[PDB]
Amino acid sequence: MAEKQRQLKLQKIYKQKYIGLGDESTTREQWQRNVRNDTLNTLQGHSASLEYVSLSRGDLSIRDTRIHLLKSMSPGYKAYLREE
Amino acid sequence: PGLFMNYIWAGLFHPAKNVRKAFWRVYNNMYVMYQDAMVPFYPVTPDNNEEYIEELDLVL
Amino acid sequence: SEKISDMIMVRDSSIGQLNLHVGLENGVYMKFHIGDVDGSFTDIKRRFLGLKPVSLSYLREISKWMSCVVCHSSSTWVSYTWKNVWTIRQLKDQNMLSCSKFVNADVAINGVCSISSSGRLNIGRVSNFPTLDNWFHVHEMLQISTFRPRTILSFPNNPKSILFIDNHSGKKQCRISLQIDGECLKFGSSDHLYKILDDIDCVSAAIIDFTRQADHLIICAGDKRLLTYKILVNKDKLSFDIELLHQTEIISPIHAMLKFKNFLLTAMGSTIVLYGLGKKQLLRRSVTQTPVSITKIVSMHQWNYERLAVGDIHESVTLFIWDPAGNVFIPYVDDSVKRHVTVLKFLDEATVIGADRYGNAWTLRSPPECEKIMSNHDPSELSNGAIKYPLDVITLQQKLPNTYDCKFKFQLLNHFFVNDIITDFHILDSLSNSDRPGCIYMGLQGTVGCFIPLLSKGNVFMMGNIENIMAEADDTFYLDYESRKKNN
Amino acid sequence: KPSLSQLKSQVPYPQIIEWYDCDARYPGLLASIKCTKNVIPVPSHWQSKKEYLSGRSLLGKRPFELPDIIKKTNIEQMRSTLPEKSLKEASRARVQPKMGALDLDYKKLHDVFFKIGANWKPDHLLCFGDVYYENRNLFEETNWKRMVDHK
Amino acid sequence: NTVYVGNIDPRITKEQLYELFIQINPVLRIKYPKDKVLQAYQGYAFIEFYNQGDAQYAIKIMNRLIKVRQVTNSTGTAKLFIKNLADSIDSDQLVKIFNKFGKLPEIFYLSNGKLKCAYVYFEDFEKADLAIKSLNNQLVANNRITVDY
Amino acid sequence: SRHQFDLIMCLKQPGVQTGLLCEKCDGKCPICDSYVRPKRKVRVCENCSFGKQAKNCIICNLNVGVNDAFYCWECCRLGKDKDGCPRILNLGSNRLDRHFEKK
Amino acid sequence: LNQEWNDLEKIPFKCTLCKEDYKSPVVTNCGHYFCGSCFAKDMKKGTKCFICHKETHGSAKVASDLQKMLNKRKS
Amino acid sequence: LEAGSKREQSQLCVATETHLELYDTADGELKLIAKFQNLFATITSMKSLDLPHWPTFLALTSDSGNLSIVQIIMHAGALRLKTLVNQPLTRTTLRRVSPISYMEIDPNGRCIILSSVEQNKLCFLVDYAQKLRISSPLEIIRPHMVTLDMAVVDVNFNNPCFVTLEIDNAATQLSVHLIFYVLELGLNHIVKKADYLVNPSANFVLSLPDLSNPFVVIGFENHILVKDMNGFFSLKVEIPKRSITNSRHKNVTIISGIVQKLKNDFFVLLQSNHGDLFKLTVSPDTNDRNRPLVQLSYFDTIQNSHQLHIFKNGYLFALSEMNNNFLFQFEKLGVEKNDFSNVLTSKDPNKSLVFEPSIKLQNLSILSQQLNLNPSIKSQIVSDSPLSIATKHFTNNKIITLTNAVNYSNLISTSLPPNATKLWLIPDPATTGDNNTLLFITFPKKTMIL
Amino acid sequence: ITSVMDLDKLQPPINQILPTLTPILRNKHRKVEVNTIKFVGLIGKLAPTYAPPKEWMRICF
Ligand SMILES: [Zn+2]
Ligand SMILES: [Zn+2]
Ligand SMILES: [Zn+2]
Ligand SMILES: [Zn+2]
Ligand SMILES: [Zn+2]
């Protein structure tokens, strides 16, 4: 009882630091997003993996791929491209 | 994390609320130690989720 | 050992160490630290350069002032020493029978005169030395080309005659430029040293010899069309011509193809297709559907026409066997973990080296349980028919239909992380007459590195101990500092 | 709530899916994860009120056998553990005491772990997807490898 | 490719069955049935072959005494002499060693076990001829064997 | 603490100040509570600094601190090093209950 | 304390090879001592000391200090 | 280095993830001085901090979640890279919450400031004493906001400010809004001053020095803005364009933007996707009031540049992204503000100018290059034994053969009679004080002299 | 005094000190047990060779 209710306390502290930590009842919608935002973070982060994506896209400047990756972290970037 | 996570993906959802509850503890401990180290290993495919990420299939 | 062919003695100013430079007959070169007062011989440094008695000679150069002793053999090796290391190397001139310093106008520094192995007097200027800091010397208003390069090929028969292909950024267009030996070629009688194909852009290309006496080029357009040209060197005008033949329609983009026996082995997105050559087009001599996991084939490579290795975008890797009389490849081994392959090879017939998008570089070996079996049977047996599989292995299939489908798994053999994305491995049989065959990789952000096998059991121990020493050094120094503050 | 027949059609390996997978909050996803290339199923002793390890097999488990290489070191004889001293004679041992009880040889012990048993590796171990289910017994399976080879 | 083999002596083991049937062809698995808790054997066992043409051969060939009893085998529902055997050598072991020369036996034993010799009748005297020579002498289990007509 | 469940760590952004341990709790990792093989100094947040509070052991927070506190090697391999301020706030069930019984 | 768990003459006068008087003496990186003929012949087979079996590398000093201590007059 | 007493701001250190190097200038051409030991981490940012009252020591944050202030120093006989302060932050990997990847430094050296993408941003407050000293960090955590382009405002010692473009991660629509922060040294915490919502296209921010409430230049897709913090001024200048617009043409954008000010001259170099390079000035607009006028005009262009720097010398350094970094000096200093022909103004934002890119390169001058192979998409090995590698060059598209050997140039060969063995040389004793030199050959029968 | 000063020149000497301590380990209390165990372990480090090994075994009990 005393232990189990410590466990809650660290769960809410870790989730604040590290953002996505699924608990027990996590919507598939909810989990998937965390999987999308870590890939976008890693793809942009390593300098190799930003090149490899930039060249493959044929995007004009490495920098614009890096923003293409960050705006994708928003859910309304799909809509925003469609209205261009 | 990859060879270890193979054991943990299955019951990470699962119907059981209990089996589910126990796997999530382990996954939570892993995600803390590895956030960017899990990214290659997630069991996610273009159909399995709506959006996926189209830049993971790109080959130069 | 053998009788001494030649010897020299040199004192280099900086360290003041007095060095005995001893050539030998049979090719082995040696060097010795010498004590000035005592006369002792220490710090023996040998090497093996060419096959022929050595006959050294001596010079004085720069880059601060320096001295090096070139070594004459089947090829010339200079043998300088930068600060507190010494590196024997080679020299781009095939050989020099004797070499001696020279000073002149037009302004000469490093200038050196020598006699070629043809017995022909000539002058040279020795320029770049590979210090450990740089170690590779590059050779060839604001300068911008519109064509961004795509691939590079090599003729299978002609050992090194390298072909180049580019692509336009703009209206789709492609240039081709060949070079044999030193410098390029002209196109036919044209001024230009390149060709320009129009409406073609190369997704991936390979040159393949369907027959022994000719060479063909294969391009995949993005249009899903597979174009085959023909390479004609004049020999000796000499110039290159490229000659159109076919047009072939394809379902996939074809990210990889290579030369399997007599054939193009091309990899459609899902499936493998094996093409021969025909008039009017090229035609499908075989097809194999892939097991369910593999969505694309990013790259693939073979072993002596017997086996394949097939990478995937997302899944790891698979091995195959060519089965004649079945006219199909039958998978025998899969992998445990998800690994995104950029490139893949065979060090050996049971093993594989690879890379990832994420920077890992790993080696996978196929288990001996599978080696006994694949050694004691004829491939036609694997697909259907009787192979006697141990009790266990089947029970893994039934217990895990997804994982153990194949049914064996590589044992991961090495894994290591280099933050580049490795594009090519090149497995070399030797580097500069060295015994240890290396595999030298090259990365995207620009790199070259190598994996050298350590063949000892003795070295791997020492080197191990040294990696452990330097690895935590920052911790050791810190513990000594803490405890020396605690008590002093 | 899709019937398993509906749910087994989506999957490239329909033989994993089971009656209960139907009731997952997100079955479409679960069936696709579970059928992913290398995922290994959750251990099967959930839904068992038994507490995972319960007796019937565990009644008869044998105590322990030292690996053979270690058994060469002769310790098995010097200390007999399977299966004595009056309390007065014990308290006399604290005061005396007695030296050289084991008579073990130091050079022999070192070599077993290093020189002779350098590459000694256990006979079966396990493979990637073998979970240990409650009733399994490895002592049979290990011998069955030993049996097939020698006969 | 499943065989019921009964009338087993309550001490025959799965190991002994393996040695017995293994010569007929590769085995997938063997099970001697035992009482749930006392483990007392039930005097019969299932022997699963990989190829039914082996199971059938075993049924039409080993239908033989084990620890004193003749085994009843059913679907689950050219003479040479050998002397100086390694005692650890039983019928199975004897079969496996000579079966290589062609289609074929009994290692004869008495209260104190392996008694030392036995015979093996080959379907061919050519087979027998090859058995002799290629075996007579050479050491089998530390011991040197005498293989004659 | 590893074995005493009620005590609540801080877990805030570590500042530049080093935690201290009393003579009795000296030589211990504040996470796993092991006496072996230290690696890195601990670093605690400002809001665990200020006045009298700063001096007290970062484990019992009762006695006054003297030596620096290090993380053990194993807690620096897993990463539990950098989670946050490794300082115990409450005195805990065990310490109080002994105290009242004695008087 | 010896743990199992973990005017001395060390110079033989006659050779370990000749078993004779040292003539044209030789020193190694050890305190080894041989004839000029001795040490050259051992390397025709052996990689290492005739005694230590440590690495000699064929390295041999003129040993005159031997002849000294083999003098009755030393140096 | 080499000089008992010399101090000049011309010198530069350049890093890539693992690797790190130091170059010098003021000789007119960029020299390599030192390459340091192998780092074994991932350097995720590097910014010099120059602090008042003394060398400068590059503050370096990486993987490992350490803020490491390093002083490159002379020790033993060779340059070493010596560390001063490494403060712990978060955990070791390159991970979204952890505060690296954006590091911008108060121009005077009062404080470093770090951010992440999403969650937290930190600010450490530097001080110098008998030994360098860092304050405990200053935190602000905005939970759902992924961040892009942290660029920082200079200030005259008032109180350090910085500006970011943050986009919210959880919302129905994409709205990416610019947000000012002011560290208040008096109360010692970071305050959020102004928050303005700008169109979704926003790409990057840049600081305009003084205008004597600081102004920022915000690059959108096909135009620029400047904004004041209080909202008083929002000025659009539609960015110019090429004439041809070959094949695939993106909306343009602006990727770099230095500001280099001298002698009341305020101008800023601001470059776009295509490599085009523009200059702004902000002019008092005397007629209306004294209020800003913004002007885009054209410069030399160049290949794309990850980041730009201007020395106290006229020299300019452009760090190219795809390869082959450069060093320019600019003589011309661009087209004067006077022309209404080729220059745009803030008078009306709606208007568009077309220009023709000049291959001549009039304003700048090359002075230097550094050959890098940034991408190498394929290569071959030719000549196993000397180990040559043939590969291309991405932007230049010329062949590059990269070998291990000793480069040996040949000149004036001459035919010698058959079968020579050795060769010698002696400075000629005959003519004493003359270059003449005896060259000897030898044959098995014969001996020749020259 | 013992850790500070050389062992060889300790006046009592050591071999006469250590057998006097072993019956003190039975002294219960704490101040005696603590301060003794630190003294005995000192000699285990610095001068193991003095007391015979059956004396070290009397301490291990
Ligand atoms: Zn304490
Ligand atoms: Zn710890
Ligand atoms: Zn705290
Ligand atoms: Zn002798
Ligand atoms: Zn020796």
Side-chain angles (χ1 to χ4, degrees), chain G residues 58-72:
Chain G
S59 66
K61 281 196 175 180
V62 163
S64 62
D65 291 342
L66 287 181
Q67 292 170 333
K68 297 177 182 175
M69 296 303 291
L70 288 174
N71 290 334
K72 297 161 197 170

Side-chain angles (χ1 to χ4, degrees), chain C residues 334-336 391 396 401 403-404, chain D residues 15 37-38 127-130 144:
Chain C
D334 191 62
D335 191 6
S336 176
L391 194 163
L396 285 176
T403 298
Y404 277 89
Chain D
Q15 68 211 60
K37 175 40 159 22
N38 266 356
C127 194
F128 167 69
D130 291 347
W144 184 260

Side-chain angles (χ1 to χ4, degrees), chain C residues 215-460:
Chain C
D215 292 349
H216 295 281
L217 188 136
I218 310 294
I219 299 292
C220 294
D223 197 10
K224 299 190 298 179
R225 294 179 301 100
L226 178 65
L227 283 76
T228 72
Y229 296 86
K230 184 178 169 52
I231 284 103
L232 303 165
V233 294
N234 285 283
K235 294 299 189 178
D236 49 357
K237 295 295 189 292
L238 56 83
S239 174
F240 76 92
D241 183 4
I242 197 65
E243 191 279 338
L244 176 63
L245 291 178
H246 305 293
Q247 183 74 250
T248 298
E249 189 156 25
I250 294 303
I251 298 176
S252 63
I254 307 296
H255 302 295
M257 73 197 88
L258 61 88
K259 171 171 171 285
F260 199 74
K261 62 180 63 177
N262 297 140
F263 296 154
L264 272 200
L265 185 56
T266 191
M268 301 290 178
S270 182
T271 185
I272 293 168
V273 177
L274 185 63
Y275 286 120
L277 180 64
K279 303 160 70 66
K280 193 60 157 181
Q281 69 170 14
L282 52 74
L283 43 87
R284 300 170 314 156
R285 191 56 54 84
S286 171
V287 293
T288 72
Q289 288 302 329
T290 191
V292 181
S293 64
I294 301 180
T295 293
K296 285 193 190 167
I297 288 99
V298 172
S299 173
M300 64 193 296
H301 185 269
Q302 72 167 19
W303 183 252
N304 62 23
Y305 307 133
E306 298 303 322
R307 292 183 169 80
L308 269 183
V310 166
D312 305 333
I313 299 173
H314 298 152
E315 290 83 357
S316 295
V317 60
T318 311
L319 257 52
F320 288 155
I321 304 105
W322 174 244
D323 179 54
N327 194 27
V328 67
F329 294 111
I330 187 72
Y332 70 116
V333 167
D334 191 62
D335 191 6
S336 176
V337 175
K338 186 190 305 296
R339 292 174 181 166
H340 308 74
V341 302
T342 58
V343 67
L344 183 139
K345 292 297 179 67
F346 277 93
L347 166 66
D348 183 3
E349 172 265 336
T351 193
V352 173
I353 298 116
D356 294 355
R357 301 277 195 77
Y358 302 94
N360 305 285
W362 37 257
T363 291
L364 296 180
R365 193 191 290 275
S366 176
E369 296 82 354
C370 177
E371 289 305 320
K372 287 207 157 65
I373 288 174
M374 292 311 304
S375 64
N376 285 337
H377 291 299
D378 296 343
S380 299
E381 292 176 347
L382 303 195
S383 65
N384 191 346
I387 299 299
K388 296 298 180 290
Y389 281 140
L391 194 163
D392 306 335
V393 179
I394 293 109
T395 49
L396 285 176
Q397 273 189 337
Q398 283 94 11
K399 200 183 307 152
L400 292 169
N402 64 34
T403 298
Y404 277 89
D405 189 67
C406 282
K407 41 178 169 300
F408 286 118
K409 310 288 272 199
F410 292 107
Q411 61 157 327
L412 179 64
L413 190 57
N414 307 146
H415 195 284
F416 186 85
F417 169 88
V418 38
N419 67 337
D420 281 347
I421 289 178
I422 292 172
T423 60
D424 284 347
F425 287 91
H426 301 98
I427 300 101
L428 297 180
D429 191 13
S430 292
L431 280 62
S432 302
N433 298 130
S434 175
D435 183 61
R436 286 165 167 73
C439 55
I440 170 166
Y441 74 92
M442 184 190 74
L444 186 72
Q445 288 99 351
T447 292
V448 287
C450 54
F451 290 144
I452 291 104
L454 264 35
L455 319 179
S456 296
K457 83 195 172 66
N459 280 288
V460 60

Side-chain angles (χ1 to χ4, degrees), chain A residues 20-83:
Chain A
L21 259 72
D23 54 9
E24 174 284 284
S25 67
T26 49
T27 11
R28 155 244 211 100
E29 271 283 279
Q30 196 161 49
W31 178 60
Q32 283 195 326
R33 177 179 292 174
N34 285 332
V35 181
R36 176 187 180 72
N37 293 346
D38 293 345
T39 59
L40 295 173
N41 166 21
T42 94
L43 278 170
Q44 64 124 275
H46 306 250
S47 72
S49 184
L50 213 163
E51 291 275 344
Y52 200 80
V53 169
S54 179
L55 299 187
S56 64
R57 285 170 112 290
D59 262 305
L60 278 116
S61 73
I62 280 159
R63 210 262 217 263
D64 288 354
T65 56
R66 177 168 181 201
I67 289 173
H68 180 60
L69 298 178
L70 294 179
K71 308 280 198 54
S72 296
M73 296 185 50
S74 186
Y77 186 72
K78 289 297 178 60
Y80 170 76
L81 293 174
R82 189 181 297 105
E83 295 181 8

Side-chain angles (χ1 to χ4, degrees), chain H residues 260-268 279-281 333:
Chain H
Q260 165 52 257
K261 64 204 181 64
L262 48 70
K263 188 64 171 200
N264 294 279
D265 189 8
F266 177 88
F267 75 103
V268 312
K279 65 168 291 182
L280 293 180
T281 53
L333 200 129

Side-chain angles (χ1 to χ4, degrees), chain G residues 15 17-23 34-38:
Chain G
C15 297
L17 294 173
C18 289
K19 295 174 185 174
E20 296 175 347
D21 296 345
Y22 294 144
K23 292 189 171 189
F34 301 97
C35 289
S37 65
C38 293

